[PDB]
Symmetry: C2
Subunit: 73 residues, 2 copies
C-alpha cells in the first residue's frame, strides 16, 4: 500500500542526506501527495469543484486555496 | 517519484467505488501519509521531538498534536 511507499521514499530520502540540513520535510512530502490527490479528484469529478470538495471533505474555498498553491486553478 | 505512487493508489481506489460515497478522502490519504512520515522522522531523530519538529519545519507543539492524533507519542 501507500504508507509503505512513503516509508521507502523517506529511507531513500534520509540516505541522500549524508548528514546535512532539512528544515522543510512536511511541506515537501505534503506537496508530493497533495498535488496528485487534487489532480485525480478533479479528473474524477470532471472538473467539478463542489463535488470535489464534498468527495474530499474540505470546503470549496480550501479546495481553491490548495488548487491555487500548486498552480492548478 | 512518490507523486506517481499517490496517483496509482487513487486510481485503484476510485475503481472500487460504484455507489460508495466518499466524504473524507483528504483526511484518509493524509492519515496514510503522516503516520509513516512522523514515524520515519522519529526513528531518524531517535525520538528527539525538537530535532524532528525542526527537521520538518513544524512547531514542536504541532508535532506533538499530530503524534497524539495518531496515537504515536
Amino acid at each position: 500500500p501507500l504508507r509503505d511507499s512513503v516509508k521507502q521514499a523517506l529511507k531513500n530520502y534520509f540516505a541522500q542526506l549524508n548528514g546535512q540540513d532539512v528544515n522543510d520535510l512536511y511541506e515537501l512530502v505534503l506537496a508530493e501527495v497533495e498535488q496528485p490527490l487534487l489532480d485525480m479528484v478533479m479528473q474524477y469529478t470532471r472538473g467539478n469543484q463542489t463535488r470535489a470538495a464534498l468527495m474530499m471533505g474540505i470546503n470549496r474555498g480550501t479546495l481553491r486555496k490548495k488548487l491555487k498553491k500548486y498552480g492548478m486553478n
